[PDB]
Amino acid sequence: MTLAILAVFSVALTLLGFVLPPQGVKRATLLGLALALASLLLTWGKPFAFGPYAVDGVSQVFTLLALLGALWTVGLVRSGRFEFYLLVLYAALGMHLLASTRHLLLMLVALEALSLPLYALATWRRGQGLEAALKYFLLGALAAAFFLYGAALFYGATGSLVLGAPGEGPLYALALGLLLVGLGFKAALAPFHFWTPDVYQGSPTPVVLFMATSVKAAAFAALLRVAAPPEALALLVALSVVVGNLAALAQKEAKRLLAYSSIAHAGYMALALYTGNAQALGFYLLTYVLATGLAFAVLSQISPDRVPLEALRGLYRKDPLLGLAFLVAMLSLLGLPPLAGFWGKYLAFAEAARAGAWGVLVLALVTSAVSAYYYLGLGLAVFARPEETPFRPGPPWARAAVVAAGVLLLALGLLPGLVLPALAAGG
Amino acid sequence: TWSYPVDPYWMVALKALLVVVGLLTAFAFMTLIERRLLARFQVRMGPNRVGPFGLLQPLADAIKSIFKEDIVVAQADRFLFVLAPLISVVFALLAFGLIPFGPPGSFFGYQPWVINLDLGILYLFAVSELAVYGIFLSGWASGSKYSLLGSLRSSASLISYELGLGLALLAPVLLVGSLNLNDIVNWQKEHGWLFLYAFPAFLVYLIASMAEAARTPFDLPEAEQELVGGYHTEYSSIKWALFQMAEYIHFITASALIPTLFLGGWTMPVLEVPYLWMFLKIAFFLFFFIWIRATWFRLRYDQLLRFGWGFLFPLALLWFLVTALVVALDLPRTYLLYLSALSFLVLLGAVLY
Amino acid sequence: MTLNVGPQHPSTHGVLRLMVTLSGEEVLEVVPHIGYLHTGFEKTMEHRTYLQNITYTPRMDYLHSFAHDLAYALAVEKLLGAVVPPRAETIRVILNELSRLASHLVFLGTGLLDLGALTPFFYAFRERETILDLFEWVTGQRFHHNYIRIGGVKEDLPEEFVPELKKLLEVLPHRIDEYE
Amino acid sequence: MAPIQEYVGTLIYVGVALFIGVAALLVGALLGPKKPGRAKLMPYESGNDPAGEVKRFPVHFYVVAMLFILFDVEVAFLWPYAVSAGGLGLYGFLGVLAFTLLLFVGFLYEWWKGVMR
Amino acid sequence: MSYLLTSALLFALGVYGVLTRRTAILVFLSIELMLNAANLSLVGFARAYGLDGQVAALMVIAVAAAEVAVGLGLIVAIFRHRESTAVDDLSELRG
Amino acid sequence: REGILFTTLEKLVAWGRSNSLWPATFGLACCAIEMMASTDARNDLARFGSEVFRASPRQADVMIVAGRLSKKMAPVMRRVWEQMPDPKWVISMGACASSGGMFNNYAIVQNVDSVVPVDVYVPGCPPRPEALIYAVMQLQKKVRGQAYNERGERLPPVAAWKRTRG
Amino acid sequence: MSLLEGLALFLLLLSGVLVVTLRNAIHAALALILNFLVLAGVYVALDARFLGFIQVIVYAGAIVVLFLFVIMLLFAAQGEIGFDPLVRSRPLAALLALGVAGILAAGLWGLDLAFTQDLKGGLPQALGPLLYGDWLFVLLAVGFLLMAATVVAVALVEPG
Numbered sequence A: 001m002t003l004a005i006l007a008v009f010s011v012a013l014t015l016l017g018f019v020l021p022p023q024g025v026k027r028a029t030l031l032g033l034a035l036a037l038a039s040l041l042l043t044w045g046k047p048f049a050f051g052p053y054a055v056d057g058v059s060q061v062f063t064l065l066a067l068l069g070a071l072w073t074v075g076l077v078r079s080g081r082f083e084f085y086l087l088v089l090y091a092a093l094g095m096h097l098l099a100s101t102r103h104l105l106l107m108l109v110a111l112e113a114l115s116l117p118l119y120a121l122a123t124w125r126r127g128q129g130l131e132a133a134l135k136y137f138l139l140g141a142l143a144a145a146f147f148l149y150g151a152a153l154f155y156g157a158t159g160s161l162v163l164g165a166p167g168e169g170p171l172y173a174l175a176l177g178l179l180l181v182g183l184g185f186k187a188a189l190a191p192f193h194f195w196t197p198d199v200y201q202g203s204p205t206p207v208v209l210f211m212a213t214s215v216k217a218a219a220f221a222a223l224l225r226v227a228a229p230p231e232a233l234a235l236l237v238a239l240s241v242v243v244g245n246l247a248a249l250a251q252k253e254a255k256r257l258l259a260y261s262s263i264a265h266a267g268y269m270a271l272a273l274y275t276g277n278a279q280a281l282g283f284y285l286l287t288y289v290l291a292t293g294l295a296f297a298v299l300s301q302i303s304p305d306r307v308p309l310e311a312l313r314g315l316y317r318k319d320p321l322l323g324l325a326f327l328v329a330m331l332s333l334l335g336l337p338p339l340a341g342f343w344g345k346y347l348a349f350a351e352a353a354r355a356g357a358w359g360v361l362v363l364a365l366v367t368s369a370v371s372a373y374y375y376l377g378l379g380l381a382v383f384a385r386p387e388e389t390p391f392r393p394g395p396p397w398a399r400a401a402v403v404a405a406g407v408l409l410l411a412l413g414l415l416p417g418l419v420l421p422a423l424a425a426g427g
Numbered sequence B: 001t002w003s004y005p006v007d008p009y010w011m012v013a014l015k016a017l018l019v020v021v022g023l024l025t026a027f028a029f030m031t032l033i034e035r036r037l038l039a040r041f042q043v044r045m046g047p048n049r050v051g052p053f054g055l056l057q058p059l060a061d062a063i064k065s066i067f068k069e070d071i072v073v074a075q076a077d078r079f080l081f082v083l084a085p086l087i088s089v090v091f092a093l094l095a096f097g098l099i100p101f102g103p104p105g106s107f108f109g110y111q112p113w114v115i116n117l118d119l120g121i122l123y124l125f126a127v128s129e130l131a132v133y134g135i136f137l138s139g140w141a142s143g144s145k146y147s148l149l150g151s152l153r154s155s156a157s158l159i160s161y162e163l164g165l166g167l168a169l170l171a172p173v174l175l176v177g178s179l180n181l182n183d184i185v186n187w188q189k190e191h192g193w194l195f196l197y198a199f200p201a202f203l204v205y206l207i208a209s210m211a212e213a214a215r216t217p218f219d220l221p222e223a224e225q226e227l228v229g230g231y232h233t234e235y236s237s238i239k240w241a242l243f244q245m246a247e248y249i250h251f252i253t254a255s256a257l258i259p260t261l262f263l264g265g266w267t268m269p270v271l272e273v274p275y276l277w278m279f280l281k282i283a284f285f286l287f288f289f290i291w292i293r294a295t296w297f298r299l300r301y302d303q304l305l306r307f308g309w310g311f312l313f314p315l316a317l318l319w320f321l322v323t324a325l326v327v328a329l330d331l332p333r334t335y336l337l338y339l340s341a342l343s344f345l346v347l348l349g350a351v352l353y
Numbered sequence C: 001m002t003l004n005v006g007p008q009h010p011s012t013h014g015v016l017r018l019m020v021t022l023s024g025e026e027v028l029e030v031v032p033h034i035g036y037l038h039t040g041f042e043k044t045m046e047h048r049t050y051l052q053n054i055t056y057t058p059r060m061d062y063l064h065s066f067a068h069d070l071a072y073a074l075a076v077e078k079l080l081g082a083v084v085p086p087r088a089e090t091i092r093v094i095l096n097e098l099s100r101l102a103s104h105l106v107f108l109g110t111g112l113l114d115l116g117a118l119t120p121f122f123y124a125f126r127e128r129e130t131i132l133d134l135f136e137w138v139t140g141q142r143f144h145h146n147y148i149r150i151g152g153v154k155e156d157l158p159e160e161f162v163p164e165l166k167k168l169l170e171v172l173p174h175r176i177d178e179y180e
Numbered sequence D: 001m002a003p004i005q006e007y008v009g010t011l012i013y014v015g016v017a018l019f020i021g022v023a024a025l026l027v028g029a030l031l032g033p034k035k036p037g038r039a040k041l042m043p044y045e046s047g048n049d050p051a052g053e054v055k056r057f058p059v060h061f062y063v064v065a066m067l068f069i070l071f072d073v074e075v076a077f078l079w080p081y082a083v084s085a086g087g088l089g090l091y092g093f094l095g096v097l098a099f100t101l102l103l104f105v106g107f108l109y110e111w112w113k114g115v116m117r
Numbered sequence E: 001m002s003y004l005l006t007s008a009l010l011f012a013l014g015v016y017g018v019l020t021r022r023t024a025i026l027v028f029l030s031i032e033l034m035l036n037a038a039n040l041s042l043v044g045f046a047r048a049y050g051l052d053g054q055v056a057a058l059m060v061i062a063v064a065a066a067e068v069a070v071g072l073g074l075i076v077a078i079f080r081h082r083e084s085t086a087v088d089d090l091s092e093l094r095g
Numbered sequence F: 001r002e003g004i005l006f007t008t009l010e011k012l013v014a015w016g017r018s019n020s021l022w023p024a025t026f027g028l029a030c031c032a033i034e035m036m037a038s039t040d041a042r043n044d045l046a047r048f049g050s051e052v053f054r055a056s057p058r059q060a061d062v063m064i065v066a067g068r069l070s071k072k073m074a075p076v077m078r079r080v081w082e083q084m085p086d087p088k089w090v091i092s093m094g095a096c097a098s099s100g101g102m103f104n105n106y107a108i109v110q111n112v113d114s115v116v117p118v119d120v121y122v123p124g125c126p127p128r129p130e131a132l133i134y135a136v137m138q139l140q141k142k143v144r145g146q147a148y149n150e151r152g153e154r155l156p157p158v159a160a161w162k163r164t165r166g
Numbered sequence G: 001m002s003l004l005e006g007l008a009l010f011l012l013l014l015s016g017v018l019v020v021t022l023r024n025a026i027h028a029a030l031a032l033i034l035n036f037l038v039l040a041g042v043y044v045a046l047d048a049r050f051l052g053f054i055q056v057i058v059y060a061g062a063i064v065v066l067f068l069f070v071i072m073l074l075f076a077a078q079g080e081i082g083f084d085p086l087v088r089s090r091p092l093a094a095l096l097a098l099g100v101a102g103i104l105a106a107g108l109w110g111l112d113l114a115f116t117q118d119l120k121g122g123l124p125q126a127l128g129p130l131l132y133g134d135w136l137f138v139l140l141a142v143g144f145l146l147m148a149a150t151v152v153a154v155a156l157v158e159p160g
């Protein structure tokens, strides 16, 4: 009843904010998130379905990741507007509804239910935040139009709005293309990625954390249900990884460079969509969500609005633990042993080779080797001389969160044979 | 339209044309009657002049209205300025055919009504939105923000109460189970006078129709003595006549629909005569509404919106939910009679403090 | 919205121009503009004999004019020490309170009509006619009556004035209590 | 249900209404002195600026209309339950009641924050 | 089939609008045209495959109303005090 | 088209314009209350066809200059008069409007015919409401084309047709 | 059919061309309302009647009313101000605009479907049980979405 917990807690808190101080509302949101997470743990391997709502390994794992991101990003937000939390809750539930169904139209409703609150969530009033949010809104509504005509052409190709239907030839290809348009757009895959740099630079840092973890998690969760063709997948991966890393080289700003890196990271993730393994992909997204939440909590402690690369420099002298954790996250996102990001990347590569697509994989790997440039210019910068840099060294809440995230990354890198056994049915 | 026949299309055109010209002559003579009834209300007596009964003053007024220098204002939109009255009039005339004036054939052979759509109340609601459309569109087209703010008042208030109309109209559908007015009327024949079951909704419908240009928000608005209203202040010969005409047709359409749905739209237990009882109830609602016209003040469109949103709509939706409880469980129909009688006693006995 | 509620419109009684500084439906502040009726009584009065200026006195505040009539009369009298007989003074205060009644009737009729409903304008204004009839009985004029004089009043009351006035004094308390 | 004939009669109704309205507009326009003047065509209110130069109007109208779009969507969803009820039983009533209560919670929020603004 | 070709053509037209229009609100209107064309296609295919696409299109209109409400709030927020809503005036955040 | 070019049609439209006189309220001074009293519940200008009262100038034909026309109101009234439909009539109510009245000074137009084409003049101070009805009856039979002056001349139906307005 | 069918299709297509062409926001939106009326007629012709009535009441009565409200609060109609026209965008986008149709035509060209089903009118009488039923969860999700959008817009404007 995790859906029940989420919906009930959100609806109650909505009015309760009139009687509750913002701190109490934050505590209650935290409680609801933790309760849903625990309910997921107790239902490990407990498929539970009501209608089109279908809880499986994918829904379970990815909504767990989304709840993780939501818990963390709420940890930072202390503003005296309960709304800045309610939407969070709302968004969370939407992304759950994104992963827990096969119904295309319900997929659209969930996409709106998660995207709408995030749009307003980027309103620190900072003018560039509004520019980014407007770009996000217009591109998202366009992609929603595309996704909608995709669901229409799907119903044209089959009597049900559920994936898995037999499907015709060219018409099913066209409907699949129209769905993949919006879904990859939400997945920060090229050639639909352009919103990502602008939004990551403009939006407040913890919001960018929340987005870059939970949004992408739920998007790939829904994507695994699709029977994506190999050729369209080749185009998406090639363009995404190439443009992501290449444009990432030239960036002087931390958030935008990280946006391009996240484009490259989605390009890496999309390989499991070749087989729809959904186990390797769950592992990958676990590692990625942890590392990104870590890095972005660091960026928040630096400056919420904007953080340039030089701001990252000298982090170790300011905070050694934060510098080390940022190094660990940069490496795990580089996919290097013995870190869990390397296992997730390797598992995706195994799925891709098992699908038999060679050139795409080779180009992706060469571009990943290219990625080491900025992965290092971030990770190694931990030790540099502190130049002018905004530094407010956070609470111990986020410090312990960052520490545990890095520890989980390195542990699952050394011993992935612990959780990966339970990313399938989940014994 | 399971049980109701169909006249030939040429008869449809004939009947529509007769309904339009009847609405014309009717609103003219009703302007006379409103003037004279207001007069009786305010001691002063009406036009014992040009008639005898005044019933030739409307012709003089119309004949002046034409030849009255229909002017195309400069600094104004060439097209919308002239076009909007067509919308306001056309989409006002219609939505009157559905009202049953008798059983089939009681039109001396063919049909009392014009059209008997399966989904009627939605038709009425849709074309009701278009009257507000024409109103505020004309308000804009003048290019005078003086009238523009009044047009905005019009649209805001009428749209709020227009929403409330839906929550009012929900409840009787549960009992009837059909969206054609004639089935509702036959129901009112069998079980009897639906308002006995749903008086509160009736109120929130009735009061809602009071906001729909009858009077008392009276922030409809008119130019007189306040921030000028929309749909006037720049039109001279016929278009102004078209706006007043459409507003009065909306008035009579509501004053006929209210007896149709909740009360006994004709369907009389006594003498069961096709037309006369319907016309008499229409005139009765006219007498009450004119009593209100020359008896109650304005509501300022601020208190009016607050009242519409906080009072009418929650109450209407609550009544719908209660009626839905009774219908879904479907055991009695008496429970609704009891609860409605209690509700009316509440809304009435709470006054005499 | 620096909105110009112009002179005489919309039906702004007492021809007046208002520049409503306003954003929305509130009222920030209204800048008034008057002077649209300045006729120059303070000037034209300098050129009429003391007897004649009684013709200029009522027409300025045309609702409660007898206050004008009486104030001007008293000022001139004090200036030259004239004695008003008690009957004259009593008639003056009667007419003063009567025009007060007519003025307040017109004021509340205009106010009630100004925003809201029209009806009660008539009944109260109705009484004004009756009151005017009363005045037409004594002064032969509806308003702008030229009756008062420096010494006192122009001429005597007819026998017909008192009964009509008693009839109105009988109907008025019930009428006013009805409005209240 | 209903035969298509009544819908054709509906279109005929619209055609007749439009025919009469356009006829009335032509009667009004053709019959008149038609001697417009430079001042006659002036908008209103004593020289210029009935309103004239004013800044943008209050968002209150916007808020009311947005409220209206959402809550008329609500009513549009409430109608199918209004017609088909007995087949939906207590289950249908309870589902529609939960839906109604969600949107009524939205209303209670906007009310306790209020819209005078 | 005529209706589905009409849906495709209207979708293309609304895309032309979204790309061409300089102001946000006209872009938003073009998006409305695109979504409604999609719903038209859905109604056709529901007539073909059994009436479920009708409920689909209804839910779609509700979704469009929600996204319109939010988009209008955002459009108001950014360009109420600011000058003409044209999105070409906001280019601070670059690659 | 101007209400002309058929012997019956011009009679008909003149009849209509005569009894359908729709007043345009322009209250200026103390004449205004004796104007309104021509509508109170002793004596109503609400029978001949003047019950309703469109304050708008875009919708009313008779302009009742009730009170002294102060000069600062003259140009405004000017445009207000031009903001009337062309089938319009202008009555000059009171002495102060018709003549200079007793206010023979720098402040008041001594005859409103200067700025607006006057149809009917009405002396009095204030003109008894029934005299205002008499003036509108005078205007009535004028716009019917049934009015003659002391010199024997028939007067045109609509004054303000003969002025090169501009 | 085809006699009035082609006419309705021309009305639809031309109205879309207008709403994407005209620089007057009010005129574009009103052409779009004409489009929606034609579209409700088409829906009725497709035996979906309730959906057409809702398309009229919801879109026209509510949404574009507010559209017009906003552009009247904020004139904004002639958007071509502060142009940065980027002249190349006018033809090139049209090209792309055509392409997004052609590939769709490719999916639909040479495609004939079983359009033989007796909907018996898309009335809510029959549409309730699908809406309240197989779709009841989707309806509840949409309602929650509506509440979330309300809170979003309110907290978004919320001057304080």
Ligand SMILES: CC(C)(C)c1ccc(CSc2cnn(C(C)(C)C)c(=O)c2Cl)cc1
Residues within 6 Å of the ligand: C011, C012, C013, C014, C015, C110, F025, F026, F027, F028, F029, F032, F036, F039, F053
């Ligand atoms: C509708 C009626 C005919 C009753 C009407 C006609 C004209 C007006 C506006 S002229 C006007 C009105 N009242 N006053 C007082 C003396 C009461 C302040 C004025 O000074 C002026 Cl100038 C208002 C109502």
Ligand code: SF4
Residues within 6 Å of the ligand: C059, C144, F029, F030, F031, F066, F067, F068, F093, F094, F095, F096, F097, F101, F124, F125, F126, F127
């Ligand atoms: S004629 Fe007499 S009543 Fe009329 S405005 Fe002049 S002073 Fe006043």
